[PDB]
Each structure stands twice: as structure tokens, then as C-alpha cells.
RNA sequence: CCCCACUAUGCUUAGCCCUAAACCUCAACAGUUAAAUCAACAAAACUGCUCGCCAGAACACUACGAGCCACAGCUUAAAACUCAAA
């Protein structure tokens with residue numbers, strides 16, 4: 001004697017109730033473990049509903065301040081002919097090297113945007129980096 | 136020079152010639168391909184009639200006029216009378232989507248005429264007279 | 273002083289790459305089926321590229337190659353669909369082999 | 373007719389790790405053949421039917 | 422009638438190949454919609470009937486383009502089985 | 508709180524929207540050369556936007572310009588003026604043989 | 605039903621007539637997407653508020669009355685007899 005109403009509550013609530021009513025003679029092997037270490041959410045069936053009107057998902061786009069520097073660098077200088085190595089967790093691309101120098105010069109008190117971008121290109125050229133302008 | 140499907144424009148200086156004649160001087164074979172008949176008239180560049188043949192004038196009657204073989208026969212007849220008058224090259228102007236639209240042109244070729252161009256002049260009104268009501272079949 | 277997830281994500285190469293369209297990346301061939309090369313390049317999904325006509329035999333399991341990425345995940349929503357259809361693979365163009 | 377042996381003991385645990393497929397013998401063979409094909413890659417008629 | 426002649430709907434014949442010239446002319450008139458226009462004009466189509474067919478044609482074109490796009494997208498995985506035996 | 512958390516802003520990598528070949532240019536009924544690029548060479552038929560690639564706004568301006576030029580005596584109706592047959596082909600239509 | 609001919613008519617002008625499967629077959633305005641998503645199909649399901657309208661079928665886009673440039677018309681619109689369905 002039991003319940004296969006998977007859309008009525010959860011396996012825990014259905015099992016706990018039928019144990020109280022005496023329908024289930026013994027508790028299942030998992031019941032005591034669930035009780036001591038329950039999930040964060042009780043697994044209750046829900047019907048996913050579609051959003052309408054002014055309802056929107058709460059997920060937000062992930063952006064960083066340096067993304068503005070990356071967008072300009074790719075526009076001005078394009079993607080580096082050097083290839084990304086996404087397997088190395090400490091890989092640094094030419095754009096990242098540009099962004100780090102751009103951040104260093106901003107902390108030195110410079111605040112102009114068009115001026116802070118031209119000085120950064122010169123610094124890297126002095127260090128031997130190849131920066132071929134796209135246009 | 137590469138071949139151009141676009142006809143030579145009058146007043147411009149083209150190098151194309153047919154028996155020493157320019158495109159503007161080639162006679163015209165007017166083919167009216169109707170649903171129940173096909174009429175062919177060959178005229179000179181000055182609009183002088185040279186030959187006329189239709190499926191009806193070739194001894195076809197009723198539904199037999201509206202066949203390809205009847206139009207082909209009409210083309211051969213018009214070609215023969217036109218060839219006697221000195222026509223070799225013709226410009227084809229066909230109006231209508233009848234069964235003798237293409238067959239009438241074949242007959243002109245089998246009759247000894249050389250088609251240098253094909254022009255469609257099927258009348259399409261741009262808004263015009265109301266056509267007859269649809270048929271219930 | 274335990275690094276947070278927000279820090280790992282900010283400084284990850286995949287985050288730093290930005291958009292993937294027209295980005296050169298290094299991939300690794302991990303599976304081959306006839307002339308179909310399955311290449312992982314550090315993303316969620318692998319890409320499948322046909323063996324190049326020239327130097328086809330140089331492309332073997334483990335061979336590292338250069339790719340021009342087009343999409344990290346090929347997905348599209350078709351008319352009358354509540355979600356997006358995904359083919360579970362990235363779109364990339366195989367340029368050649370990476371050598372030292 | 374040959375009788376298939378018990379597929380679990382007294383504790384109720386099936387002997388074969390592919391029991392719950394219902395075709396443990398067939399799928400175990402596919403697993404063994406698929407496994408051999410993999411090792412080859414890592415390493416690399418008339419009278420019979 | 423008032424326009425110049427032998428410019429509109431005029432195709433020149435190459436090397437006496439009149440069959441290929443006629444097919445080119447017919448293809449031109451078809452692509453520009455003149456052939457279908459001539460046929461629909463033999464009998465009067467009533468305005469309610471024209472709207473119904475134009476609406477039907479526009480919905481069928483969209484449905485076919487959307488069904489072609491789906492198959493093109495879902496044919497990327499038509500490659501051989503990578504995990505045969507599993 | 509935490510410096511590495513995402514920050515709210517507008518997409519910095521967003522690409523500009525597409526533009527038609529005539530976006531930002533005045534379409535005059537007297538410029539028959541431009542208008543002739545959007546009519547059929549053989550029949551003079553105005554091309555739909557799926558052939559011209561124009562947007563709704565410029566498709567409308569071109570259409571209205573052609574109709575004005577035709578009836579005012581600047582542009583032929585039944586064929587493309589042969590003077591403009593060698594102009595840049597900007598329409599996605601293949602005709603000959 | 606098919607073919608041909610031709611008229612009222614389709615057009616203009618000035619008056620009428622006031623109907624339509626006049627139909628997104630979705631009343632106006634405002635709001636919501638979380639609840640149970642929801643008889644079915646149509647077109648995802650609802651809330652507030654207001655007006656209009658409906659109360660078995662058929663009789664009945666009818667009768668009579670009244671109004672109307674309408675006079676073989678339109679609008680509004682019953683009853684008796686009948687049925688256990690529609």
C-alpha cells in the first residue's frame with residue numbers, strides 16, 4: 001500500500017503521512033537520511049509557467065568595468081593574431097595585457113579616456129608588443 | 136566580345152549585322168498566340184506586310200486550330216511567303232500564352248527563316264478593363 | 273583569504289575573451305570519426321571540423337589546432353517553440369595545426 | 373530448457389551492475405566490445421559466417 | 422504603346438539556339454511575375470478572393486522558409502555516429 | 508561588499524544595427540540612375556525588398572520615387588532605361604541564361 | 605451549371621435607402637503573469653470597473669403597435685397551438 005501521486009507533495013511528505021496512517025508498515029531505507037539531512041528545497045512537483053506582460057526573468061547580464069576597455073581595444077586593434085589558450089587558467093591575451101596597463105595608468109591619476117588609451121598603446125610598443133591597428 | 140542577350144539600342148553604334156543589315160532594319164514576325172488560334176504576320180522594319188498565316192487559313196477548324204501542330208503549320212506557311220519576298224532574318228514578337236506560342240516560332244525556322252531575337256508583348260493592363268467572370272466547372 | 277567564485281569568473285580566460293565571434297583559440301582533438309575531428313577548445317561544447325584536405329594525416333588524437341570561433345553554442349528558436357533548439361556543439365572554423 | 377540463474381541474493385542486491393537495464397548479458401557484451409574498440413585507438417569470409 | 426519597342430522583354434538569340442533564348446525569356450517573365458499575372462487576369466478574381474489567396478501565399482512562403490531553416494539547422498548533426506555501440 | 512561582483516551597465520560589445528545601402532541618403536525622383544537600379548531590366552517591374560535588400564522606409568521612398576518619376580516624364584515604365592544597364596548591380600536577382 | 609449577345613447595374617452629379625458572415629465571430633478603460641494553466645475547440649489564464657445584452661427549442665430577421673424621404677422596405681418585437689429536447 002502506497003502512493004504514486006508524484007504531483008501531490010513530495011516523496012518525503014507522502015511517505016511520512018502514510019507511515020503515520022499505518023499504511024506503510026516500515027519506513028524506507030532512505031527516510032531517516034532525508035530527515036536528518038534534507039534538501040534545501042523539498043522536491044514538490046511544479047508546472048513551469050510562461051511569463052506574460054511585464055514579467056521578466058531576474059537573471060542579469062554579467063559585465064565588468066574592463067569590458068569597456070576590451071570593446072574599444074577589439075574595435076581599434078582587432079583580435080590579436082595570438083591565439084587564446086583557454087586551457088591555461090592563467091593565460092593573458094594582448095587585450096588583457098592592454099587592460100592591465102590601462103588600469104595601472106588610471107590609478108596614477110590620469111582620468112581622460114581618449115588620452116589614457118593612447119598612452120597605453122605606446123607603453124606596450126616600448127615593451128615589444130605588436131599592435132597593428134585594424135584601420 | 137562576349138554575347139549580350141540585351142538587344143542593340145537604336146542610335147548607338149553596334150557592330151552586330153545580319154546580311155549587312157542592322158537590328159533596326161530586320162523584319163518582324165508578329166505571332167499572336169491565342170487560346171483557340173494562332174496568327175502570324177511578317178512585316179518589314181517600315182511596317183510593310185510581307186506574309187500572313189493563321190491556323191484557320193491553313194485549313195484547321197474548331198479545336199484543331201488551338202494546337203501546336205496547327206501553329207507550326209501556320210509558321211511554315213508564313214515563312215514560305217516571306218522567304219519569297221527576300222526575308223531571311225526576323226525579329227519575333229509574340230503576344231499571348233496560347234499553345235502556338237512556341238510552335239509558331241519553330242514553323243518559322245523550319246520554313247527557312249532565322250530568328251535573331253524574341254520579344255514578348257503579351258498585353259498586361261496596369262490596373263484596365265474588367266475580365267469576364269470566373270467559370271464554374 | 274579564500275578566493276570567491278566572483279573572482280574566479282572575473283579573471284577566467286573565457287570571461288576575458290569577450291564575444292567569441294572571430295576569436296582565434298587553440299583546440300585539442302580528442303575524438304575522430306572518419307574525417308570528422310572533435311575538438312575541445314576550453315568551452316562548454318566541442319566543435320566538429322572536417323579533416324583538411326592538405327596534411328590530413330597530421331590531424332590525430334591529441335593534436336593541437338588553431339580555430340576561429342563563430343559560436344560557443346549553436347542554438348536557435350523556431351516558430352511555435354517555447355524554448356531554443358540546441359545541437360550541443362560549438363561553431364568554429366579549423367585553420368590549421370599549432371606548432372612550436 | 374536451460375533456466376536463467378537467480379539475478380540477486382538474499383539481500384536483494386543484483387549481481388550484475390547492468391541488471392536494471394533488463395538485458396544485462398546483451399549490454400555487458402556491447403560494453404566489452406565498445407571498450408575494446410577504444411583501446412585500439414589509444415594503441416593506434418568464405419568458410420565462416 | 423508610347424514606349425520604345427524591342428527593349429522590354431526582348432532576348433537575343435545566340436548561335437541560332439532559339440530554344441535556349443525562349444527558355445531565358447520565359448524564365449525572365451516568370452521571375453518578374455508576368456506569367457502568373459497574365460493567367461490570373463483571364464477571369465476576374467473578386468477582391469475577397471484575391472485577398473484570401475494573397476494571404477494564403479504569404480503564410481505558405483513563411484511556413485516553408487521556417488521549415489527549411491529548421492532542417493538546415495538540424496542537419497548539422499547528420500554526421501556519422503561518434504559513439505557507436507553506446 | 509565584493510569588488511569582483513558583476514556591475515550593471517549596457518552591453519559594451521554590442522554591434523551596431525544593420526543598415527541598408529541607402530540608409531542616410533536622400534532619394535530624389537530626378538535621380539533616375541539610382542531608381543533604375545531597383546527595377547527589372549526586361550520588364551521595368553519594381554523589385555520587392557527581398558530582392559533590393561532595402562528596409563521598409565527606403566523601400567517605400569524608392570517605390571514612391573519611381574512612381575513619381577515615371578508619370579512625370581523622367582523614367583520609363585515598361586523597361587529599364589538601357590543607359591543604366593552597366594551600373595552597379597545591388598539586387599539579389601539572377602536572370603540571364 | 606457551359607458558349608454568345610445585350611440591358612438594369614457597377615462610374616459621375618444631386619438626393620435618398622440605412623442593410624451585411626458590417627466578423628479578430630475577442631464590448632470600452634485599467635491592471636497582473638503569481639495562483640488552479642485550463643470543460644472542449646478557438647485565441648495562454650485572469651482581476652478591477654462601467655455600459656450594452658441574454659435566460660429551453662420552434663413559432664420568429666414573423667404578427668400587431670409605433671417611428672422612418674423608406675410604400676413588395678427598415679428598426680423595435682410578441683403571443684396562441686406544439687415539443688422533450690434544441
Ligand code: FES
Nearest residue numbers: 526527530562565
Ligand atoms: S536601414 Fe536606415 S534607412 Fe534603411
Ligand SMILES: [K+]
Nearest residue numbers: 625627628629
Ligand atoms: K470573419
Ligand SMILES: [Mg+2]
Nearest residue numbers: 611612613614
Ligand atoms: Mg449599361
Ligand SMILES: [Mg+2]
Nearest residue numbers: 262263615616
Ligand atoms: Mg473613375
Ligand SMILES: [Mg+2]
Nearest residue numbers: 624625626627
Ligand atoms: Mg468587413
Ligand SMILES: [Mg+2]
Nearest residue numbers: 631632655656
Ligand atoms: Mg461600449
Ligand SMILES: [Mg+2]
Nearest residue numbers: 659660661662
Ligand atoms: Mg426561447
Ligand SMILES: [Mg+2]
Nearest residue numbers: 623624665678
Ligand atoms: Mg434582414
Ligand SMILES: [Mg+2]
Nearest residue numbers: 665666678679
Ligand atoms: Mg419585419
Ligand SMILES: [Mg+2]
Nearest residue numbers: 667668669670
Ligand atoms: Mg406594421
